[PDB]
Amino acid sequence: VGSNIRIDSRGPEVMRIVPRLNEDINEEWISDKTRFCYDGLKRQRLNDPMIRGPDGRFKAVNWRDALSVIADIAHQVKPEEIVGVAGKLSDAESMIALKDFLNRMGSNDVWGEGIGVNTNADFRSGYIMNTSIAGLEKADVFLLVGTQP
Amino acid sequence: SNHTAKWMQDTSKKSPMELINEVPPIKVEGRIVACEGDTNPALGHPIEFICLDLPEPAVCKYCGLRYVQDH
Amino acid sequence: GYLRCLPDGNLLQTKIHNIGATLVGVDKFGNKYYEKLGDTQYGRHRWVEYAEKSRYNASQVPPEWHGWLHFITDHTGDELLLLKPKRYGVEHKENLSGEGEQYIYHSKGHALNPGQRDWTRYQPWES
Amino acid sequence: VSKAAEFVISKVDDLMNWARRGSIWPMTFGLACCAVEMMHTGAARYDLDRFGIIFRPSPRQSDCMIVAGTLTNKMAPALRKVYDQMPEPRWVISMGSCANGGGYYHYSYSVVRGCDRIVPVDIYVPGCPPTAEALLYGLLQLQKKINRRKDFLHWWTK
Amino acid sequence: DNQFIFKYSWETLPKKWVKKMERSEHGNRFDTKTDYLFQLLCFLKLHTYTRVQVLIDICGVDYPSRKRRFEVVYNLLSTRYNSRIRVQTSADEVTRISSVVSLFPSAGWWEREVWDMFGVSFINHPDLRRILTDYGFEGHPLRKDFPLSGYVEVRYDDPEKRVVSEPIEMTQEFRYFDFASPWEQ
Amino acid sequence: HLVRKGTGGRSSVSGIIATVFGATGFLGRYVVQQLAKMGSQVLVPFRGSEDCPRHLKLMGDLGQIVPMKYNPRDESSVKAVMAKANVVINLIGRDYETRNYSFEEVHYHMAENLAKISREHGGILRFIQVSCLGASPSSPSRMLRAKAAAEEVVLRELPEATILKPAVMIGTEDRILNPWAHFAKKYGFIPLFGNGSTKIQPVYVVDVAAALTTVLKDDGTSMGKTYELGGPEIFTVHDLAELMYETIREWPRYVKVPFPIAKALATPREILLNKVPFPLPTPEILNLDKIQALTTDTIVSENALTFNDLGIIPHKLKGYPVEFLISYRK
Amino acid sequence: FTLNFGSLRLVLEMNGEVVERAEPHIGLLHRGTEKLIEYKTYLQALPYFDRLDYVSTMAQEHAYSLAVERLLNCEVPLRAQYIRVLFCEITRILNHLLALTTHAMDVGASTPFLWAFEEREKLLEFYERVSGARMHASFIRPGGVAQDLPLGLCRDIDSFTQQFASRIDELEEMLTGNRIWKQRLVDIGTVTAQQAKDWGFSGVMLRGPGVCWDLRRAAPYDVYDQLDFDVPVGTRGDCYDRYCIRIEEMRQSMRIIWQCLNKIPSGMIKADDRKLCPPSRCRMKLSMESSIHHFELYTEGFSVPASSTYTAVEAPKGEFGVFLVSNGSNRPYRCKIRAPGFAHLQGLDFMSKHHMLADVVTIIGTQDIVFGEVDR
Amino acid sequence: KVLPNSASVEEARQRVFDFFRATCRSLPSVMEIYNLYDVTSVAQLRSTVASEIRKNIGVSDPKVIDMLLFKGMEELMNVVNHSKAISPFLKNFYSSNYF
Numbered sequence A: 001v002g003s004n005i006r007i008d009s010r011g012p013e014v015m016r017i018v019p020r021l022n023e024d025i026n027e028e029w030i031s032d033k034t035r036f037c038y039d040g041l042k043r044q045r046l047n048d049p050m051i052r053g054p055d056g057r058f059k060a061v062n063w064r065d066a067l068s069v070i071a072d073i074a075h076q077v078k079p080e081e082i083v084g085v086a087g088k089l090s091d092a093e094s095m096i097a098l099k100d101f102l103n104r105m106g107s108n109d110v111w112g113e114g115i116g117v118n119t120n121a122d123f124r125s126g127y128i129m130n131t132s133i134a135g136l137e138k139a140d141v142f143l144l145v146g147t148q149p
Numbered sequence B: 001s002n003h004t005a006k007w008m009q010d011t012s013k014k015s016p017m018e019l020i021n022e023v024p025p026i027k028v029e030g031r032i033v034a035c036e037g038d039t040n041p042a043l044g045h046p047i048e049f050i051c052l053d054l055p056e057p058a059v060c061k062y063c064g065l066r067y068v069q070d071h
Numbered sequence C: 001g002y003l004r005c006l007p008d009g010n011l012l013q014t015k016i017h018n019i020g021a022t023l024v025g026v027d028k029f030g031n032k033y034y035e036k037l038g039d040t041q042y043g044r045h046r047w048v049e050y051a052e053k054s055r056y057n058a059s060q061v062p063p064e065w066h067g068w069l070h071f072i073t074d075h076t077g078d079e080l081l082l083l084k085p086k087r088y089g090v091e092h093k094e095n096l097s098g099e100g101e102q103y104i105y106h107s108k109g110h111a112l113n114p115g116q117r118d119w120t121r122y123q124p125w126e127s
Numbered sequence D: 001v002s003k004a005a006e007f008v009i010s011k012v013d014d015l016m017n018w019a020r021r022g023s024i025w026p027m028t029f030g031l032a033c034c035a036v037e038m039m040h041t042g043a044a045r046y047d048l049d050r051f052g053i054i055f056r057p058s059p060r061q062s063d064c065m066i067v068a069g070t071l072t073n074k075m076a077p078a079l080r081k082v083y084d085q086m087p088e089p090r091w092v093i094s095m096g097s098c099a100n101g102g103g104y105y106h107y108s109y110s111v112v113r114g115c116d117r118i119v120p121v122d123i124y125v126p127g128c129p130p131t132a133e134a135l136l137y138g139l140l141q142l143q144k145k146i147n148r149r150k151d152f153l154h155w156w157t158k
Numbered sequence E: 001d002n003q004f005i006f007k008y009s010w011e012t013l014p015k016k017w018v019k020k021m022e023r024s025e026h027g028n029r030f031d032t033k034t035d036y037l038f039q040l041l042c043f044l045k046l047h048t049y050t051r052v053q054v055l056i057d058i059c060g061v062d063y064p065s066r067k068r069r070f071e072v073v074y075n076l077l078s079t080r081y082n083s084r085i086r087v088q089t090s091a092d093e094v095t096r097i098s099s100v101v102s103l104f105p106s107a108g109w110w111e112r113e114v115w116d117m118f119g120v121s122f123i124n125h126p127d128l129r130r131i132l133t134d135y136g137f138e139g140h141p142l143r144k145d146f147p148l149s150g151y152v153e154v155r156y157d158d159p160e161k162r163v164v165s166e167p168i169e170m171t172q173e174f175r176y177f178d179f180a181s182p183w184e185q
Numbered sequence F: 001h002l003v004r005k006g007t008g009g010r011s012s013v014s015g016i017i018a019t020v021f022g023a024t025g026f027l028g029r030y031v032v033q034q035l036a037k038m039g040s041q042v043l044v045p046f047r048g049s050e051d052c053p054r055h056l057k058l059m060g061d062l063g064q065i066v067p068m069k070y071n072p073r074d075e076s077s078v079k080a081v082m083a084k085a086n087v088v089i090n091l092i093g094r095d096y097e098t099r100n101y102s103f104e105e106v107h108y109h110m111a112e113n114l115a116k117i118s119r120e121h122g123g124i125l126r127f128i129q130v131s132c133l134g135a136s137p138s139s140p141s142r143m144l145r146a147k148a149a150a151e152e153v154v155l156r157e158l159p160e161a162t163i164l165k166p167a168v169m170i171g172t173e174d175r176i177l178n179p180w181a182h183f184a185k186k187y188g189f190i191p192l193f194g195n196g197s198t199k200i201q202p203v204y205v206v207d208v209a210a211a212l213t214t215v216l217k218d219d220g221t222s223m224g225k226t227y228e229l230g231g232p233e234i235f236t237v238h239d240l241a242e243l244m245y246e247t248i249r250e251w252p253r254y255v256k257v258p259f260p261i262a263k264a265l266a267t268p269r270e271i272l273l274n275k276v277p278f279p280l281p282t283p284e285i286l287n288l289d290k291i292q293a294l295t296t297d298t299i300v301s302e303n304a305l306t307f308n309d310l311g312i313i314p315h316k317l318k319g320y321p322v323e324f325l326i327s328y329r330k
Numbered sequence G: 001f002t003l004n005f006g007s008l009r010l011v012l013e014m015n016g017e018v019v020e021r022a023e024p025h026i027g028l029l030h031r032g033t034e035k036l037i038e039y040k041t042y043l044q045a046l047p048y049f050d051r052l053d054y055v056s057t058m059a060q061e062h063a064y065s066l067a068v069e070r071l072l073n074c075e076v077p078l079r080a081q082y083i084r085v086l087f088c089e090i091t092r093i094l095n096h097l098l099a100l101t102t103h104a105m106d107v108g109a110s111t112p113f114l115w116a117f118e119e120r121e122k123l124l125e126f127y128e129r130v131s132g133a134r135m136h137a138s139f140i141r142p143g144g145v146a147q148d149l150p151l152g153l154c155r156d157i158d159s160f161t162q163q164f165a166s167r168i169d170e171l172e173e174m175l176t177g178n179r180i181w182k183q184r185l186v187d188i189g190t191v192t193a194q195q196a197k198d199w200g201f202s203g204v205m206l207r208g209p210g211v212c213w214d215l216r217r218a219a220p221y222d223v224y225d226q227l228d229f230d231v232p233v234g235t236r237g238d239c240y241d242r243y244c245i246r247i248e249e250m251r252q253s254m255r256i257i258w259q260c261l262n263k264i265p266s267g268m269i270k271a272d273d274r275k276l277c278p279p280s281r282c283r284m285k286l287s288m289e290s291s292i293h294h295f296e297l298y299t300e301g302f303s304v305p306a307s308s309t310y311t312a313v314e315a316p317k318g319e320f321g322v323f324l325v326s327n328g329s330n331r332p333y334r335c336k337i338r339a340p341g342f343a344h345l346q347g348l349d350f351m352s353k354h355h356m357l358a359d360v361v362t363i364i365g366t367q368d369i370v371f372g373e374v375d376r
Numbered sequence H: 001k002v003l004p005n006s007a008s009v010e011e012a013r014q015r016v017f018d019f020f021r022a023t024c025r026s027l028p029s030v031m032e033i034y035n036l037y038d039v040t041s042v043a044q045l046r047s048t049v050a051s052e053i054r055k056n057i058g059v060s061d062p063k064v065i066d067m068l069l070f071k072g073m074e075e076l077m078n079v080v081n082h083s084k085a086i087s088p089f090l091k092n093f094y095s096s097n098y099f
């Protein structure tokens, strides 16, 4: 939904999340997951580049070493069997950077999370909410197929 | 527990939580009480009125004292 | 303790002032509290002999006698000892502050603290 | 290293500490509004001349610098220059809150967050202003601190 | 009170430079143009029935929203007629306004202070060096955009054997508490 | 792995807890200042008086500079000092002897003890030990031989240990230029030793401190290396004396006493020190160990790693390093 | 030639020991007080005025509270007004004693210093009994005062007033009439009334020439218009006449103190409205609205209407003024602090012209420059 | 002495020339003030001052030019009174996230 929120923080940590007015997306409301997702930002948080050694345990290394080993392994393999997967949450900058890097490495196998093998992604009107939330307000009959809002 | 160990490290004297759990509940005849903190209202906390319909003791939320209805 | 007067000179002044005084009290640490009214100026009618002539300190006065000595209250230390709270409380300790790292107060993050606590407000993955 | 030489060394150190404790010659660094309370300390009531404290206007003859008041970025170089002229046996008493950690002007431009950043201070005197009673307590604390200086023993065991 | 010489001034003063006037119990206010401020103060100081011959002070106020952010205020007093008057103008960062050191000799240090705190330069000041802040200060502290803690801080550098100035790295950052009530308006 | 948690400068983290043994000396000031400027925490273990690390307190943020009192002969005290350490720096060493501490005890045995404790305490990531440039097993000087043996035993016991070998260091608190200036002011002349034809490579102390900081910041390239540190150009002793005299703006004067009579003059101090139970004045100039070190040239070997290999160029010794000698003018 | 002195830095141009000109450098105590006041609430900014002109503490509190009440229009009870006057006059006595004795020490007279410090210790004991600390007691607040007078304070102040009349007679006998004191003071740093008006002098430095103008009579901001005191003026403005004016001001301050003690009323100590003055502890612990108002007044502040004003009071140094500009918020938008040391230190240049070094230090002592208020 | 704002580009240029003259005449005093004779290169210092003046050519407002000259003269007085290959992106990346 991309509901607009205000993150209230006291120092280096997020303290709470509250809704904010956006009549086009969310009037004044907010879901429980959106409101209380701030707690997960302080648990199981990765904070150092790591490499899995021969023993199977992770050793923390520098960004230089991590990038060097990644680049060496990427150059070692042929570009046909190189795949890139975008996560559930990712900004357009990161996704376009990943696509450009993998394409310049010779691979055309970059895809995002929740995208099928044969998806006709050539039409924004095809894959977005054309009616918009205001149109949903203006609607009269709904046909919900394959979705549980 | 975790909170007490977070603000205190002495771990040899009795923490305020243990003392306030050790002080017994105060039995009162009426259905409502006036919780003031000590014998002098001006030297305690703002007055707190506590409902005692629930069977379990009710914490004052100020100087928590666990008032319990008589019958 | 009278031989300390010759190399102290301040205990000498105290002993000179304890000629006509009346011993109003004594604390559990040995400090003897004196009062002297009559023809005495206002600022010098209550005082203490610390009973530790070698290394007497201004912070050795317990809170029970602190107010009476500082002229805050007319209540002697005995009444405040009677009114001392129960179920909690610590004994009076002097302001050491230099007598030892094991004696002075240390913050939770100080390296000299027996138990030093980290401060990051996040839990790493910790494989 | 023996037990009689150790006793003689202890007696010599005790004499030296007694002399340095009874003949403290502090110098005022009287900025802002702890200096008035310092003059109250030097007054008739809480007299400092009894304990040996006399204020020497010349830093070359002074023993310990008592910084009382707010330290400004415009004045910190002057404070450091004056401190550097003091003799090697030297001490610092930071009086008030401005000279300790910036005090009431901690979040302010042109204010040094305590004199500890400019000179090595030995004893802090909390208060704003600290009572003349408390400042004399701090001076007695300086006497106590310099009452445990085993300079002769340290020189002997080198 | 004592709104006598204020009304007399508005009756006798030339109307060319009186941009606006305010009749208040908090202080009678004149707001004019920077071109005619010197002439206006010369008239008030010298006239026999508006003798504001002592300059109380010169102040500056920063208004980032306005085109001319700086507001230069002059508080003057008339001891002969026992009343205070206020004359202010608007100046920006670059433009130089006229100096009144010749009329009131006390205005030199207040004008230097205004320069120091805001950056409003004066035309006929005998000197306009900084007065209050540190030697070699770079910014103007009293501007609203100027951070409260400043940009640099000083410390003793042992290898240099001198007190050096370094960019701020202060611990325990200033905690701005937003107490404003939404029902105050 | 150390983690940085700040922009830099004062009031940062830098993820380094450095225990600096011998931090109250000439180089200790600069190394502790550099470490505290980095934002790291510095544990300063001081031997005697409580005011010895006093200045070191002002160069770091609150709680960053921690002074610890210890006994150098106490293994338990050394372990307690090194309990919270992350990296260890060793600067302990005296230019002369005492009835209690000899050259072997102050350098070799203490370096061995530090290496053993660092090996036992598995949390140590870096061990930077400072010796002299002329430290060789065949060097005539007993102090240089002891420092060479100490560096050898440090390498043997703890292979993950970097060894710096700076040449003679000049600065505001140095022990060569200051005694030379004092002698010149007091007597109008300075004593050259063997007509002052021998050559050295004096190095600036802040440059040495920056070299040590770079060694600490190395990304694993100097775990078991020895770095010889020297100035930009070779200075003869006579040339250094002339530079000193030019800086003070006094007329140079030399006597050029021969090595045999210099050694004869410096000889009785050692036997007297070993005989009497009371301490003797420290030899500022007439030091037999200094004479023995001066018997042979002390310059870079051109083989070991230098300032160029480490990554910082040395500072020229005319104006930046000798600016302290102005206070000696008139 | 230029001679430098180094929180008073001063450069003097000398020809024959005669001071051609003197230039002070003042910023050595700049602390960003105005910026901090802008960044803090009004109640949090009152201690800044405590710190400004620290020799005269409660005068600055009085000026700040008067400015806030002018911008706020809240009525202060008569008892609060009378105790404010009493402690303002105590403050005036303290400042005059300190100024006179520091001037005497700078001249060379060392002994009156400690007698006047005994008197000052008595007055600081009064401060500590009535309020928190001996100095920088945040006792005067907008709308009234912090707390009521402790019982016995009036009797102690009466005893002090009698003994202090004796002490002022004592000090005047020692200092006034001394040939050395006269030779040090008379015809030193004379100022004409035109010069004082041009350079913006105020207080004793302005009444010394004989302008015959006082703020407590021109604009009475208290019960001052019911206290029928006297205002001394100098026949020929110089150090001696300014010193005599200060002595007479001490006497008149004692007079005003006695009048306030005699006619102090019985009532409340602060403004009646809890929107502007915090409620008592019992009221906030017993009443729901009082708890709300205490909470709001101690988190937020009273929101003054958006206006700009200049409020000046007769501080012991001179006219101390505060120029407050608000924007309707809980924090002051702008706070300019006109201290009566900033103008006097400008006057130093022409006052200590053709004089000598001892005359320069005498002029500094007479002007009584406290550097906190000049570096506000 | 402070002067009124320059009403012409020629007047601003003349004031800039006067300020540059003042800097050049005051350069040898800075020599004895700072004592960096080893690597000063007074000619290089003059070149750097000229380079600063030349990098401040994008300004065209006479008021801004006058203010810049005033601040430059202030800085001159302060100095006289002795008051002191892995591409750029990857180095910043290895240093910290905020760049």
Ligand SMILES: NC(=O)C1=CN([C@@H]2O[C@H](COP(=O)(O)OP(=O)(O)OC[C@H]3O[C@@H](n4cnc5c(N)ncnc54)[C@H](OP(=O)(O)O)[C@@H]3O)[C@@H](O)[C@H]2O)C=CC1
Residues within 6 Å of the ligand: F021, F022, F023, F024, F025, F026, F027, F028, F046, F047, F048, F052, F072, F091, F092, F093, F094, F095, F101, F106, F130, F131, F132, F133, F147, F165, F166, F167, F168, F169, F175
């Ligand atoms: N001459 C020079 O400057 C040069 C020295 N070096 C090497 O660098 C090392 C460090 O030099 P530097 O810092 O300038 O000299 P210092 O002698 O000033 O530093 C040594 C430090 O350790 C302390 N110390 C001395 N002896 C002992 C001991 N027996 N036990 C414990 N602590 C002791 C010293 O005094 P305290 O006990 O008061 O702390 C001082 O704090 C030298 O030992 C030498 O090997 C290399 C090139 C040139």
Ligand code: SF4
Residues within 6 Å of the ligand: D031, D032, D033, D034, D035, D068, D069, D070, D095, D096, D097, D098, D099, D103, D104, D127, D128, D129, D130, G051, G136
């Ligand atoms: S600590 Fe307080 S009393 Fe002392 S100078 Fe600072 S503000 Fe004044």
Ligand SMILES: [Zn+2]
Residues within 6 Å of the ligand: B035, B036, B037, B045, B048, B060, B061, B062, B063, B064, B065
């Ligand atoms: Zn309760």
